[PDB]
Amino acid sequence: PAVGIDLGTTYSCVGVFQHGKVEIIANDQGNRTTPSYVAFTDTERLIGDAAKNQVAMNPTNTVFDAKRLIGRRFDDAVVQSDMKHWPFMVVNDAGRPKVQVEYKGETKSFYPEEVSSMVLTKMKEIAEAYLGKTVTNAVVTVPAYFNDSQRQATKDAGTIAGLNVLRIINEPTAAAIAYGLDKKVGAERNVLIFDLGGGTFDVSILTIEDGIFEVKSTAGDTHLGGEDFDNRMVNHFIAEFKRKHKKDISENKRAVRRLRTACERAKRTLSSSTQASIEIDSLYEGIDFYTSITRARFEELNADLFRGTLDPVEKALRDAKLDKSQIHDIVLVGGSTRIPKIQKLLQDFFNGKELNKSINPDEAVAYGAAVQAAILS
Amino acid sequence: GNSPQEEVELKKLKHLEKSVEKIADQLEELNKELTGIQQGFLPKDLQAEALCKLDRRVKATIEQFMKILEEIDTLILPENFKDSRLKRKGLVKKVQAFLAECDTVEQNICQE
């Protein structure tokens, strides 16, 4: 049976179309999405949740974000720029980047597609554990703006993972397919996909004529997501602790981490409630930190960030030489699209048009990929 | 005014308490191995090497305690659940004291 795989910069998802339905396959830990992480230890190689769980213990040898290096040259501006923010080493091997790590007591380096093949092997094994059957066919998605080298490098990762890559399709196209925007009535439909998830922000405008897809334009921010919004809440609470106790917890990494984890959870709570409460005993110097934050405040702390997402929207309508009024469907993918203030800035930019979002935004792309996988199988 | 709702919270804490006991055992096992190495016949250099070799385990113990704190931090206990609140405080303090011992171990291996 063929599956659909969403290879994300930080999380991946795999789905399967069975019995006329799509099933997003949970991994060994019960998660419907798996971290795109690979860790090398003195004894073993970990992939997925196991890899992410030990990042704090082995930062320099736990790789993620391979999707940012895949199919690129070392001297690529993105590479040079991104590596300044990674704990692991990126090296140059004849103009091609490789991640360098310590593995089993030795220094080893891997090409981006090798790292991604390791992640693809996990998604393959995840589907087989669920299906109790072998998996070799699959549709893997990539960003609408990926070029030949990048597309081929992804195909290659699939191959190395022993997968038969039926096709490499664009992520926004997969999201459109999931909602079935390619089977609707009328003719030439203009669709905008708002993708804010996994640490990247991508806007894509597509035209669908008799089921055929054409990407009219792409815009976004390659380093924007939930972690930036969480950080603003953390900034909020650090200041508040300073006001109430005249103590700065910012240099105690464990206090900051407990706070950050609490804020990530409160953020999720503020997507379905107007206020979230946090109780953290002995946070810093024995001081208990019991507090709460409203949805309103959360939004004020991220005002510039949330508003900024419209920059790429208008730019996409710009290069698609279309008017906001000419967009027929709006689709939300990515976890952050669950944030109501994001849904408003959007829905009202398009003066009231209802948005497509009944499908779990973290799984829409894999979902659409599963549909396509079956039809192509 | 003891309520059945607080029992549900006290059970969560008891499971967390048990988890902490398990991590604490590993810390003790780790401590015996530490003293065993210090007491060993290994040459000062392979010794320093077996010690720093214990780095991975102390970091794993620290990480497990941190995950417990993060789990305790998801609880919301009303002011009237006094027993639950006291149990939570006691557990956090015990974990923090274990963390301090882990840090003392990190100070004796791989130099300091």
Side-chain angles (χ1 to χ4, degrees), chain A residues 1-101 103-105 107-183 185-208 210-213 215-323 325-343 345-352 354-377, chain B residues 1-27 30-52 54-81 83-111:
Chain A
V3 293
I5 300 166
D6 172 1
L7 249 197
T9 68
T10 59
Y11 284 87
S12 291
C13 187
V14 59
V16 68
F17 187 72
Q18 58 174 45
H19 325 304
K21 263 310 304 166
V22 164
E23 182 62 25
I24 299 297
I25 307 180
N27 63 34
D28 53 298
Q29 297 205 185
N31 301 312
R32 293 197 131 61
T33 74
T34 300
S36 301
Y37 282 56
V38 177
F40 298 83
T41 70
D42 69 305
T43 67
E44 62 187 317
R45 183 182 71 177
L46 296 179
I47 305 171
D49 279 312
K52 183 142 182 179
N53 299 328
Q54 55 85 79
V55 67
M57 308 151 38
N58 178 39
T60 59
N61 306 305
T62 302
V63 186
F64 58 83
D65 271 352
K67 179 177 182 176
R68 284 179 194 282
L69 298 175
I70 202 177
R72 294 182 184 282
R73 288 285 225 65
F74 185 78
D75 301 301
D76 189 305
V78 185
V79 174
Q80 294 309 316
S81 180
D82 291 352
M83 65 195 284
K84 297 185 176 185
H85 318 324
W86 292 319
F88 53 86
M89 299 183 269
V90 179
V91 295
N92 180 43
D93 189 310
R96 290 197 61 194
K98 304 194 69 184
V99 305
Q100 180 162 296
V101 298
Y103 175 47
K104 287 176 176 176
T107 311
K108 295 295 175 181
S109 64
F110 306 75
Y111 294 85
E113 55 273 13
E114 299 190 84
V115 177
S116 299
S117 73
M118 292 175 206
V119 174
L120 289 172
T121 293
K122 175 71 174 176
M123 308 311 297
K124 176 186 63 186
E125 300 176 339
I126 274 173
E128 302 177 330
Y130 173 76
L131 294 180
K133 296 201 169 189
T134 297
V135 166
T136 173
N137 297 305
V139 164
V140 174
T141 54
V142 303
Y145 64 82
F146 263 22
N147 66 19
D148 295 336
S149 178
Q150 294 176 123
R151 281 167 193 274
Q152 185 61 52
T154 299
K155 167 186 160 184
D156 288 0
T159 295
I160 289 160
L163 278 171
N164 170 46
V165 182
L166 303 181
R167 186 176 299 160
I168 284 311
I169 77 168
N170 290 320
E171 285 156 32
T173 300
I177 288 159
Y179 281 93
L181 312 190
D182 59 301
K183 299 176 177 299
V185 294
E188 181 166 52
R189 318 196 69 194
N190 283 159
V191 173
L192 186 147
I193 315 301
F194 193 98
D195 194 337
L196 188 54
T200 57
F201 172 43
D202 298 297
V203 175
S204 303
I205 290 185
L206 313 178
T207 297
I208 309 181
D210 296 334
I212 299 293
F213 290 78
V215 179
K216 293 289 187 287
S217 65
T218 66
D221 189 330
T222 64
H223 289 78
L224 167 69
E227 288 173 44
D228 299 294
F229 312 148
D230 296 333
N231 192 57
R232 285 301 179 69
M233 196 189 307
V234 168
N235 282 162
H236 169 75
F237 288 121
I238 283 176
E240 175 180 311
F241 198 94
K242 277 178 181 169
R243 287 200 303 286
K244 302 186 179 184
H245 310 284
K246 284 305 172 188
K247 285 185 183 298
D248 179 5
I249 74 166
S250 78
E251 280 307 296
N252 184 287
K253 295 177 193 69
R254 291 178 185 149
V256 172
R257 172 173 165 180
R258 286 172 77 190
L259 178 57
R260 186 178 313 284
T261 299
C263 290
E264 187 289 328
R265 183 160 165 283
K267 172 187 67 188
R268 290 193 268 88
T269 289
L270 295 174
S271 282
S272 76
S273 292
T274 46
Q275 172 180 292
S277 294
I278 299 180
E279 275 169 32
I280 303 178
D281 274 9
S282 194
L283 170 65
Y284 184 77
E285 316 264 44
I287 299 161
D288 302 332
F289 193 54
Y290 291 22
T291 177
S292 68
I293 173 173
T294 60
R295 185 133 89 196
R297 191 49 185 156
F298 177 51
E299 313 178 339
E300 293 165 24
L301 307 164
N302 295 101
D304 54 332
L305 303 182
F306 287 169
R307 174 265 107 66
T309 65
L310 300 188
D311 288 342
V313 177
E314 57 183 60
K315 186 160 197 169
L317 288 160
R318 187 202 304 166
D319 294 291
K321 301 182 173 185
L322 283 179
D323 185 69
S325 52
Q326 293 166 299
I327 296 296
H328 303 279
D329 298 302
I330 288 173
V331 176
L332 300 171
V333 319
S336 289
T337 64
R338 285 189 180 92
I339 298 174
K341 185 53 158 50
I342 292 288
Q343 281 179 30
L345 292 171
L346 188 68
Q347 178 184 55
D348 295 323
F349 180 95
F350 286 83
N351 311 292
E354 303 302 290
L355 318 168
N356 287 286
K357 55 200 182 65
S358 75
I359 293 181
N360 186 126
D362 296 300
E363 322 173 320
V365 172
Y367 187 122
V371 166
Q372 184 72 186
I375 298 178
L376 272 37
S377 206
Chain B
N2 303 94
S3 74
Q5 295 81 183
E6 174 159 38
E7 288 306 309
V8 164
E9 302 310 321
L10 286 166
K11 194 57 167 176
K12 288 181 195 166
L13 289 168
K14 289 178 171 173
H15 278 127
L16 286 166
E17 218 160 40
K18 297 165 200 172
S19 297
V20 167
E21 308 187 70
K22 290 181 298 171
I23 308 174
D25 292 336
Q26 323 195 322
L27 172 51
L30 181 55
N31 280 298
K32 293 186 175 177
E33 166 131 35
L34 165 62
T35 288
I37 296 181
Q38 280 164 287
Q39 292 278 72
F41 249 64
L42 294 181
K44 292 288 187 175
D45 60 81
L46 293 183
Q47 161 183 51
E49 289 175 51
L51 287 186
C52 193
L54 298 180
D55 183 59
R56 284 188 162 291
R57 304 172 62 198
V58 308
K59 294 188 182 311
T61 301
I62 289 172
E63 176 60 12
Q64 287 177 74
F65 280 134
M66 287 300 302
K67 287 200 172 70
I68 290 298
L69 289 185
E70 292 177 317
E71 178 157 19
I72 289 159
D73 296 341
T74 71
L75 295 171
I76 287 302
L77 302 176
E79 278 182 47
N80 59 124
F81 281 12
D83 291 351
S84 281
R85 285 198 171 199
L86 171 60
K87 192 176 205 58
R88 177 170 66 185
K89 190 174 258 48
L91 187 49
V92 170
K93 299 295 173 151
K94 170 174 267 302
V95 175
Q96 293 185 323
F98 283 139
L99 277 169
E101 283 168 50
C102 290
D103 291 340
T104 289
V105 175
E106 284 213 298
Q107 297 182 327
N108 276 267
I109 72 177
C110 307
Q111 272 191 280

